[PDB]
Every structure is written in C-alpha cells, then in structure tokens.
Amino acid sequence: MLDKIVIANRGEIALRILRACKELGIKTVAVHSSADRDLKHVLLADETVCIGPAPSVKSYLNIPAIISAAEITGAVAIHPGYGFLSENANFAEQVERSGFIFIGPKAETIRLMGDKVSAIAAMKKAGVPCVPGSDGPLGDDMDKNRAIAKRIGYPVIIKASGGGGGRGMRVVRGDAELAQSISMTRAEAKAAFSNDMVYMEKYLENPRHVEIQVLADGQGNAIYLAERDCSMQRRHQKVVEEAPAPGITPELRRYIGERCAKACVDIGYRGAGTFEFLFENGEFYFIEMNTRIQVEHPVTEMITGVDLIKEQLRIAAGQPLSIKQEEVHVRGHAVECRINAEDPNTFLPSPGKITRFHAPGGFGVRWESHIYAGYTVPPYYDSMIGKLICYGENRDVAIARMKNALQELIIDGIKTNVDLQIRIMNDENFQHGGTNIHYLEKKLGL
Numbered sequence: 135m136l137d138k139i140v141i142a143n144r145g146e147i148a149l150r151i152l153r154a155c156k157e158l159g160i161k162t163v164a165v166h167s168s169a170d171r172d173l174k175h176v177l178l179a180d181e182t183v184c185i186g187p188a189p190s191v192k193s194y195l196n197i198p199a200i201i202s203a204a205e206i207t208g209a210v211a212i213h214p215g216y217g218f219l220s221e222n223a224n225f226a227e228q229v230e231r232s233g234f235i236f237i238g239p240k241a242e243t244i245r246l247m248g249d250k251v252s253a254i255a256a257m258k259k260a261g262v263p264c265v266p267g268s269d270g271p272l273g274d275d276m277d278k279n280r281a282i283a284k285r286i287g288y289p290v291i292i293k294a295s296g297g298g299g300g301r302g303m304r305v306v307r308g309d310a311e312l313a314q315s316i317s318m319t320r321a322e323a324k325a326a327f328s329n330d331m332v333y334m335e336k337y338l339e340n341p342r343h344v345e346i347q348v349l350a351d352g353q354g355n356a357i358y359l360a361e362r363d364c365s366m367q368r369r370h371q372k373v374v375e376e377a378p379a380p381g382i383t384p385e386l387r388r389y390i391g392e393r394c395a396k397a398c399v400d401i402g403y404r405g406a407g408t409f410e411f412l413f414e415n416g417e418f419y420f421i422e423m424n425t426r427i428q429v430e431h432p433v434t435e436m437i438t439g440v441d442l443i444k445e446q447l448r449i450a451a452g453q454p455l456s457i458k459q460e461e462v463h464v465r466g467h468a469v470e471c472r473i474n475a476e477d478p479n480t481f482l483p484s485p486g487k488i489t490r491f492h493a494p495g496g497f498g499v500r501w502e503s504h505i506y507a508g509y510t511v512p513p514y515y516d517s518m519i520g521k522l523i524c525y526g527e528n529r530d531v532a533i534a535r536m537k538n539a540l541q542e543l544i545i546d547g548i549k550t551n552v553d554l555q556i557r558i559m560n561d562e563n564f565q566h567g568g569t570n571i572h573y574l575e576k577k578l579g580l
C-alpha cells in the first residue's frame with residue numbers, strides 16, 4: 135500500500151479521499167490555501183502544507199507548489215480529486231517525471247480523452263456507439279462543411295475539441311447559420327483553450343445524460359459498475375444524479391457496459407473513469423470520457439457496494455481490482471442531491487459563515503461534506519458545499535428518504551439550494567422518472 139499521499143484538492147472530495155486513506159492505513163498530506171486552514175480534512179490530516187494564498191492559480195492549480203509539498207513530506211503519490219488539475223495531462227506528466235504516482239490514468243490517456251475528436255475516434259474504433267458526426271475536425275471550406283451537415287442531417291451541433299462539459303457549443307438548424315456558428319465556436323475555443331479545433335455532431339433534441347462507471351487495474355482487468363442518470367441540470371451543471379438509470383434494463387446495461395470495459399482494454403486505461411452518453415429512443419451515443427473520479431461517484435457506491443476511492447488507491451499501488459465483473463450486482467437505488475451555497479434568485483455563489491449546522495441521519499442516509507457550525511465558505515472556490523445521498527431498496531424509497539433527510543438538514547447563515555432540491559424531489563415528472571437534460575430549466579422557466 136502507498137505509504138503517504140498528497141490530497142491535491144479541497145472541500146468535500148478532499149475529506150472523502152482522507153477517509154479512504156485512513157481506512158487503508160495511508161498517511162495523509164493536506165495541501166491547502168491560506169483561506170482553507172480550517173477545512174475539516176486539513177484539521178484531520180496527518181500533515182499539512184500551506185501551498186499559497188486563496189486564489190486557485192497560486193494554490194490548487196500551482197503545480198510547483200504541490201509537487202514541492204510532496205517532496206518535502208516524503209509523500210509517494212498525489213490524488214487530484216476532481217476539477218483543478220485532475221484532467222491536466224501536463225500535470226500528470228510532471229508528477230510522474232518527478233517520481234511520484236499520479237492517482238489516475240497515464241498522462242497520454244488523459245490527453246487522448248481531453249481531445250474530444252481523438253477520444254471519439256478511439257471509442258468508435260473500439261466499438262462504442264457514438265453520435266453521428268464529422269469523424270474529424272472541421273476545416274475552413276464551407277462547401278465541405280455544408281456537405282458534412284447535409285450528410286448528418288440538420289439539426290447539428292458544433293463543439294470544441296479542447297472543450298468539455300457541454301461548454302461553448304452551438305446548435306445549427308440550417309445552412310444560413312452554419313458559417314457563423316462554426317466561426318464563433320472556433321473563436322471562443324481559441325480564447326478559452328488556445329485550441330480552435332471544432333467538430334460537428336447530429337443534434338439530439340431531448341436526450342437523457344446516462345454515464346457508465348469503469349475501473350481498470352494494471353493487471354489488465356477492466357469492469358463496469360452500472361450507470362448513473364445525471365439529466366437534472368442547470369447550465370450544463372448537474373444538480374441531481376441517480377443510479378441505476380430509470381428504464382435501463384439489465385440487457386441494455388450489459389450491452390453498453392461490456393463495450394465500455396472493452397474500450398478500456400483497447401486503450402490501456404487505468405484507474406476510475408466515466409463514459410458519458412446521450413441516451414435517446416433506447417439508444418446510447420458516446421460524447422466524452424472523464425478520467426477522474428467524479429462528484430457523483432457515491433450513488434454508484436451505494437448500489438454496488440464498491441468503494442471507488444479505495445479502488446483508485448489499490449490500483450495505484452499495483453493491486454488488482456478487489457472485485458470481478460461477475461461479482462458486481464446492482465442492488466437498490468440511490469439519489470444524490472448537490473448542496474450549493476447559492477442565491478435562489480440569481481444562482482450566484484453565496485459565500486459566508488455558517489451559524490447553525492445539522493446533518494441528517496438514519497438508514498440509507500449518507501452526508502458527504504466538510505461543513506460545520508462556525509465554518510466560513512470562502513468566495514474563491516466552487517459553490518458546492520456538500521452532497522446528500524440516499525439509498526433505498528427501490529427508487530421510491532430512495533426519494534422518500536431524500537425528502538426526509540432534506541427536511542432535517544439545517545444550514546443557517548448562508549443561502550443554499552435545499553429548498554430547490556425539496557421542490558425537485560416533489561416534482562411529479564421526476565417522481566415518474568426519465569426526465570431529459572432540458573427538464574429542470576423548463577420547470578424553472580430559465
């Protein structure tokens with residue numbers, strides 16, 4: 135087992151990783167900004183290193199500082215969590231060059247998945263279903279671009295190759311808007327990523343977001359751990375996630391899961407990963423792969439019994455997966471509600487000091503959060519302050535328990551989205567299940 139690791143993150147996920155480390159007897163190094171000295175995981179960590187001031191550029195994105203913390207403490211590995219540097223291939227490369235273990239895939243694999251065009255080519259080659267598209271980057275020949283659009287059939291969508299998470303895309307419904315849509319997407323990608331490559335896909339009108347969890351070890355084993363529906367979104371940001379996805383049969387699960395595991399073998403994948411699909415009219419279409427552990431991982435843990443963070447750590451140590459595919463069984467149902475410190479009218483972050491706090495408890499109730507009474511939510515980081523996950527023997531019980539747990543949750547002193555989450559749990563269409571990626575914004579009239 136790894137002797138000591140740097141937790142290169144903050145907030146709830148840093149605490150999540152710390153718990154897993156403690157269970158495995160792994161010593162912890164909590165690197166933190168000057169604004170995060172009183173983070174719960176920092177207070178629980180074996181060693182702490184202040185890596186810079188509050189702004190993330192000088193702390194959680196500061197590659198030299200993080201690697202230096204690993205060096206000075208005698209750590210052997212770095213867990214990047216999610217966000218920050220977790221999808222930064224150059225960071226992974228530098229970590230390995232510096233002689234530490236990066237808890238994730240090989241840097242080349244991170245780079246492959248960060249290039250959406252290259253990622254799609256790889257998945258298509260491996261037999262994973264993808265969205266009908268350009269199968270390559272678009273050039274500047276608008277005669278050619280119109281021909282590609284005609285072959286796919288309007289409506290289409292232009293996407294940045296160096297992008298992700300539904301950001302910076304534009305839908306095109308006819309030739310008259312194609313040139314400008316391509317140009318603008320290109321320009322925005324260049325300004326954001328210094329990478330102006332774009333591609334084209336068929337635009338699906340009302341898909342659901344269904345993603346497959348995988349794990350692959352360095353012994354050649356690769357397994358899938360069912361799926362999650364993450365269709366409840368605002369501005370492409372997930373709000374509620376659940377597992378399994380309503381309406382997905384064991385046969386469909388097996389079909390798509392096997393193709394994802396096969397792809398992992400083909401590309402030499404290692405660690406946790408997520409294959410994101412659009413699901414419409416009973417069909418899956420791959421859009422992108424995330425190589426990190428994700429925010430919504432706990433719903434998969436609840437329904438499979440597999441501790442995904444511990445598996446990440448085992449894999450990085452050179453241990454084989456603790457479970458085989460035939461030992462993975464979907465049991466029950468889990469829902470996750472993200473808890474955000476946000477204004478209910480503007481949806482802007484709402485930082486400040488928590489004056490009273492009380493967490494829900496009970497059978498099937500799992501609360502993932504670093505917050506506590508008297509804790510100050512800083513303005514410098516993401517609005518998500520916790521995650522409430524409820525498990526039941528079926529979907530209805532999971533929803534019932536979430537309703538009850540949301541009512542017990544007290545977070546005073548700052549504005550949160552608890553009341554919105556209560557509204558979503560009471561939504562008749564959510565209760566029926568299978569709502570699409572546009573539903574929440576439609577409900578809210580946004």
Ligand SMILES: Nc1nccc(-c2csc(N)n2)n1
Pocket residue numbers: 265291298299300301335336337338339341370412421
């Ligand atoms: N191709 C297609 N059609 C509809 C929606 C999307 C989409 C939404 S967010 C994302 N990454 N892709 N992609």
Ligand SMILES: [Cl-]
Pocket residue numbers: 216217427428429430
């Ligand atoms: Cl994530």
